[PDB]
Design an enzyme around this catalytic site. Structure first.
Site, PDB file in Angstrom:
ATOM      1  N   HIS A  95      37.691  28.779  80.336  1.00 17.55           N
ATOM      2  CA  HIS A  95      39.070  28.893  80.866  1.00 17.55           C
ATOM      3  C   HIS A  95      39.118  28.479  82.326  1.00 17.55           C
ATOM      4  O   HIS A  95      40.163  28.190  82.897  1.00 17.55           O
ATOM      5  CB  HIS A  95      39.709  30.259  80.605  1.00 17.55           C
ATOM      6  CG  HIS A  95      39.311  31.327  81.571  1.00 17.55           C
ATOM      7  ND1 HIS A  95      38.476  32.363  81.222  1.00 17.55           N
ATOM      8  CD2 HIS A  95      39.651  31.532  82.866  1.00 17.55           C
ATOM      9  CE1 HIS A  95      38.318  33.167  82.261  1.00 17.55           C
ATOM     10  NE2 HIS A  95      39.022  32.686  83.271  1.00 17.55           N
TER      11      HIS A  95
ATOM     12  N   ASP B 270      35.420  31.493  74.802  1.00 18.94           N
ATOM     13  CA  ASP B 270      35.509  31.267  76.259  1.00 18.94           C
ATOM     14  C   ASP B 270      34.138  31.062  76.877  1.00 18.94           C
ATOM     15  O   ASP B 270      33.548  31.930  77.505  1.00 18.94           O
ATOM     16  CB  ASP B 270      36.240  32.430  76.941  1.00 18.94           C
ATOM     17  CG  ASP B 270      36.731  32.092  78.327  1.00 18.94           C
ATOM     18  OD1 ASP B 270      36.666  30.915  78.738  1.00 18.94           O
ATOM     19  OD2 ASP B 270      37.184  33.044  79.015  1.00 18.94           O
TER      20      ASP B 270
ATOM     21  N   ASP C 182      35.000  47.386  86.892  1.00 18.51           N
ATOM     22  CA  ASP C 182      35.259  46.180  86.067  1.00 18.51           C
ATOM     23  C   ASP C 182      34.890  44.884  86.781  1.00 18.51           C
ATOM     24  O   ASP C 182      34.630  44.838  87.976  1.00 18.51           O
ATOM     25  CB  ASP C 182      36.750  46.155  85.704  1.00 18.51           C
ATOM     26  CG  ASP C 182      37.091  45.280  84.480  1.00 18.51           C
ATOM     27  OD1 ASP C 182      36.190  44.799  83.742  1.00 18.51           O
ATOM     28  OD2 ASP C 182      38.307  45.106  84.239  1.00 18.51           O
TER      29      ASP C 182
ATOM     30  N   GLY D   1      38.087  35.949  89.616  1.00 17.55           N
ATOM     31  CA  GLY D   1      37.154  35.345  90.548  1.00 17.55           C
ATOM     32  C   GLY D   1      35.732  35.459  90.043  1.00 17.55           C
ATOM     33  O   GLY D   1      34.838  34.750  90.493  1.00 17.55           O
TER      34      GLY D   1
ATOM     35  N   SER E  20      35.080  35.376  86.614  1.00 17.77           N
ATOM     36  CA  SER E  20      34.967  34.731  85.290  1.00 17.77           C
ATOM     37  C   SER E  20      33.925  33.654  85.343  1.00 17.77           C
ATOM     38  O   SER E  20      33.792  32.909  86.315  1.00 17.77           O
ATOM     39  CB  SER E  20      36.289  34.165  84.778  1.00 17.77           C
ATOM     40  OG  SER E  20      37.228  35.206  84.538  1.00 17.77           O
ATOM     41  N   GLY E  21      33.195  33.591  84.250  1.00 14.58           N
ATOM     42  CA  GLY E  21      32.101  32.645  84.096  1.00 14.58           C
ATOM     43  C   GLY E  21      30.734  33.160  84.465  1.00 14.58           C
ATOM     44  O   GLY E  21      29.689  32.603  84.116  1.00 14.58           O
TER      45      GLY E  21
END
Ligand SMILES: O=C(NCc1cccc(-n2ncc(-c3cc4cnccc4[nH]3)c2O)c1)Nc1ccccc1
Ligand SMILES: [Ca+2]
Ligand SMILES: [Cl-]
Ligand SMILES: [Cl-]
Lengths: 250, 58
Positions: free
Chosen positions: A41, A90, A182, A186, A188-189
């Site tokens: 994404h 994803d 969590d 920023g 993600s990945g």
């Protein structure tokens, strides 16, 4: 990362920072000298592929200390089954233009065998997630790399404990429902890394969803085990002209 | 020994074979010891190890 701590410099050596036109895009995970795993994404909105840079050995974004290594991205490979702006499948495999040089500060995370991952790793309760993402919901991003220990939930349990996109077989839940801890925008990945008998392995990719550190919800991660064979096959393949490549999945 | 149980006693990867047979394996940059279960690095920077920590305890 919400409710974590600073990853001491060099203790997260597989962490990648992805930049577009010098701006923070996403994280990633180094799995060998030319390959990085990230989230599909992250690339939904990329206009000019030439502006995409991967940085290894990063820690404190405010400074240059000489341990950083930047590379151009030669290929971004996404599963055919991934639909932009969604959660399922994803995952992205990135080929660097030139290998990174392994150092005390730049080390790949082991991509496990599927069987091992499914039979063993999947049952290790706690794993680490890291990035330079938001420190709070609707807050500023981190200047120093952050890390967080999160427990993994069986999907059945996730659903029960939750109170939205589906949770598929291609995902898993991890974290906390109390809104304290969590991964966040920023991040993600980035890696969800699992320790077993003295070695760390890639088990998840920070995906996305509904807010960050939202009460009644858990973090969603791409279930890397589902993709091992897909990744391995791609890593054996010759590069193709044009950065973006959609590759059949399975 | 079976791979589904206790990882077949393997440190890393495990394969079941025809019979009461099992083979452990190691990731690239590691080698299998004579115990047939343990993996030892063969390179400076094997995957999934943290140098500053490995040194911190060396
Ligand atoms: O805009 C696109 N992609 C472009 C992009 C690039 C880079 C980062 C993002 N992006 N935005 C929010 C989040 C995000 C929230 C969140 C909560 N918890 C844990 C991790 C999380 N990550 C994130 O990682 C989007 N896709 C898209 C959209 C709508 C419709 C069609 C495509
Ligand atoms: Ca720096
Ligand atoms: Cl090929
Ligand atoms: Cl291109």
């Amino acid at each position: 990362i919400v409710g974590g701590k600073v990853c001491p410099k060099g203790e997260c050596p597989w962490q990648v920072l992805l930049l577009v036109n010098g701006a923070q895009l996403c994280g990633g995970t180094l799995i060998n000298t030319i390959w990085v795993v990230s989230a599909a994404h992250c690339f939904d909105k990329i206009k000019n592929w030439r502006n995409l840079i991967a940085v290894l050995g990063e820690h404190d974004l405010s400074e240059h200390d000489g341990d950083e290594q930047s590379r151009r991205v030669a290929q971004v490979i996404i599963p055919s089954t991934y639909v932009p702006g969604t959660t399922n499948h994803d995952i992205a495999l990135l080929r660097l233009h030139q290998p990174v040089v392994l150092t005390d500060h730049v080390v790949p995370l082991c991509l496990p065998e599927r069987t091992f991952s499914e039979r063993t790793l999947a049952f290790v309760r706690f794993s680490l997630v890291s990035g330079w993402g938001q420190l709070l919901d609707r807050g500023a991003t981190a200047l120093e790399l952050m890390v967080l220990n999160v427990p993994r939930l069986m999907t059945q349990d996730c659903l029960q404990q939750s109170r939205s996109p589906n949770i598929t077989e291609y995902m898993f839940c991890a974290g906390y429902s109390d809104g304290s801890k969590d991964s966040c925008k920023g991040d993600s990945g980035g890696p969800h890394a699992t320790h077993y008998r003295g070695t760390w392995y890639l088990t998840g990719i920070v995906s996305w969803g509904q807010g960050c550190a939202t009460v009644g919800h858990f973090g969603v991660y791409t279930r890397v085990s589902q993709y091992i064979e897909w990744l391995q096959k791609l890593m054996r393949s010759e590069p193709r002209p044009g950065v973006l490549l959609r590759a059949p999945f399975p | 020994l079976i791979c589904v149980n206790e990882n077949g006693g393997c440190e890393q990867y495990c394969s079941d074979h025809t019979g009461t047979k099992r083979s452990c394996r190691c990731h690239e940059g590691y080698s299998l010891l004579a115990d047939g279960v343990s993996c030892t690095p063969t390179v400076e920077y094997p995957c999934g190890k943290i140098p500053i920590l490995e040194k911190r305890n060396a």
